[PDB]
Amino acid sequence: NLYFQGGGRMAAAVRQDLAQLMNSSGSHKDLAGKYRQILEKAIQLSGAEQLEALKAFVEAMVNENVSLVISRQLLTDFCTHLPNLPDSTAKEIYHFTLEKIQPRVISFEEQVASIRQHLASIYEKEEDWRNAAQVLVGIPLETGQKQYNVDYKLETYLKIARLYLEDDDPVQAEAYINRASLLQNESTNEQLQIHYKVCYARVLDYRRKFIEAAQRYNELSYKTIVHESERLEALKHALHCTILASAGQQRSRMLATLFKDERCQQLAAYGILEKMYLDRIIRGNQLQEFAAMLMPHQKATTADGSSILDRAVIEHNLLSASKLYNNITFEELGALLEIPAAKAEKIASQMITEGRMNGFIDQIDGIVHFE
Ligand SMILES: [Cl-]
Ligand SMILES: [Cl-]
Ligand SMILES: [Cl-]
Ligand SMILES: [Cl-]
Ligand SMILES: [Cl-]
Ligand SMILES: [Cl-]
Ligand SMILES: [Cl-]
Ligand SMILES: [Cl-]
Ligand code: NA
Ligand code: NA
């Protein structure tokens, strides 16, 4: 380590063999064949020797004295061997290769894209979601000289959006699914368009845009090209989103759509659907099993311990009470809803200001007047 600072002998032979070919006058197939023989030699090495030789190969190829016709072909050939290597080795070589290509990145755009797709796949396999997404975001889909086909761009934005959802970053996921939305209609790949629709619905769900997600999931449930088991899974997602949605006209219209769909009787949450659709006041105990039916992100709680479902039930209960009574004190309204009177007033006041409940509040006497 300290006094003998040079590299491995076999990596030195590779570096040497490549330096000798740099200004060769030989024909393309002969010259490319000699570079390929050196690549096969470098690939047959086993550890630090292999890593060093493969780096010497990339460094020789990016050299401006090697014609692009050769370097593009051999860098493509080089890339085909890297997925067969251990992930830690392939990762190091992919990053090294992107770094060494950077000064001539416009000339090697095809190779950069291939490397970024393979490198992102390693980060994905290791659940390093943010690094995987960033690697794909670095592919120049619109800033390069290559005119990428629509489906390549759509597949890449969908992958980025899915990776950001895995990273619990729905705002970034939405930013990229929105770029995919501009392409999806120009695509002729129906399965990819359905994958896009599913991702878009998931992104809306993660963003707590529950009624928008419910509508998209419901529409997926109607697609006869989708297997029956997955149409029922889409319907279940639509139902859960509708229950979690903020109380009002759009939500009540979706509850009516779902209640009229006979398939909802195959879902465990049918009982809750019926009660919500009928504008019933829902008790805490009636939703414990439903709360256990939810996805992790749908169970988020604030510092006070309040969950998404807790707040949705309070809004639903307040709107339902507004249809039963002409007026009521907050003490009674709180006692009927099993919440403090101050919370009943605060949420009722918000729904009135937002236009979701018609009526007015008498703050001194603590009474809400409906209609
Ligand atoms: Cl390539
Ligand atoms: Cl971007
Ligand atoms: Cl997805
Ligand atoms: Cl269909
Ligand atoms: Cl069905
Ligand atoms: Cl909502
Ligand atoms: Cl179910
Ligand atoms: Cl269910
Ligand atoms: Na009323
Ligand atoms: Na208010």
* Number of H-type helices and E-type strands within the chain: 18, 3
The alpha carbon of 266 and the centre of ligand 7 are apart by a number of angstroms equal to 7
Cβ neighbours for 1, distance < 8 A, ≥ 6 positions apart: none
Q: How many CB atoms lie within 10 A of CB 285?
A: 8
Tell me the technique behind this structure: X-ray
Please say whether the dihedral angle defined by the alpha carbons of residues 259, 300, 211 and 309, taken in this order, is positive or negative. positive
Contact 14, 56 (CB under 8 A): yes
CA atoms of 24 and 15, how far apart (whole Å): 15
Compute, in angstroms, the gap from residue 261 CA to the centroid of ligand 8.
14
Do 199 and 177 meet the contact criterion of CB atoms below 8 Å apart?
Answer: yes
Q: What is the resolution of this structure in A?
A: 1.6
Q: Residue 286 to residues 42, 188, 313, 314, 316: CA-CA distances in angstroms?
A: 67, 46, 11, 14, 14
Other CB atoms within 10 Å distance of the CB of residue 127? 9
| Residue 25 CA to ligand 10 centre (angstroms) | 83
Q: From edge to edge, which strands make up the β-sheet containing 359-362?
A: 327-329, 367-370, 359-362
Q: What are the sequence ranges of the domains in the chain?
A: 1-307, 308-371
Task: Name the closest ligand to CA 75.
Answer: 1
Q: How far is the CA of 145 from the centre of ligand 3 (A)?
A: 30
What is d(CA 312, CA 45) in angstroms, rounded to the nearest whole number?
62
Which residues, in sequence order, are CB contacts of 291 under 8 Å at separation 6+? Answer: 299, 307, 309
Burial of 60 (0-12, 13-18, 19+ CB in 10 A): buried
User: Which H helix or E strand runs over 369?
Assistant: strand 367-370
**Beta strands 367-370; 327-329: pairing state:** antiparallel
The fold of the 308-371 domain, in CATH, is: Arc Repressor Mutant, subunit A (1.10.10)
Interval between CA 325 and ligand 5 midpoint (Å): 40
CA of 79 to the centre of ligand 4 (A): 39
Extract the tokens encoding 321. 């009470």
| Burial per residue of 324-351, b for 16 or more beta-carbon CB atoms within 10 angstroms, e otherwise | eeeebbbeebbeebebebebbbebbeeb
Phi-psi region of 146 (alpha: psi -120 to 50; beta: other; left: phi over 0): beta
Q: Give the ligand at the shortest distance from the Cα of 243.
A: 6
Name the closest ligand to CA 163.
3
Q: Ligand 9: distance of its center to the CA of 359 in Å?
A: 9
Distances from the Cα of 141 to the Cαs of 136, 149, 180, in angstroms? 10, 9, 12
Residues with CB under 5 A from ligand 5 (ion): 228, 231
Are 333 and 366 in contact, with CB atoms under 8 Å apart?
no
Whether the Cβ atoms of residue 371 and residue 326 lie closer than 8 Å to each other: yes
**What is the CA(75)–ligand 1 centre distance, in A?**
7
What residue spans of 102-227 are helical by DSSP H? 109-125, 129-137, 150-166, 170-181, 190-206, 210-221
Which residues have CB less than 5 Å away from ligand 7 (the ion)? 267-268
CA of 76 to the centre of ligand 1 (A): 4
- From the CB of residue 129, how many other CB atoms can be counted at a distance below 10 Å? 18
Q: Is the dihedral of CA 165, 167, 170, 176 positive or negative?
A: negative
Instruction: Establish how many alpha carbons lie within 13 A of residue 228's alpha carbon, considering only the half-sphere containing its beta carbon.
Output: 2
The neighbouring-strand residues paired with 367 are 329, 362
Q: Give the distance (Å) from ligand 8 centre to CA of residue 102.
A: 51
User: Of 284, 255, 283, nearest to 270 (Cα)?
Assistant: 255
Q: How far apart are CA 368 and CA 360, in angstroms?
A: 6
Who surrounds ion ligand 9 at CB < 5 A? Answer: 370-371
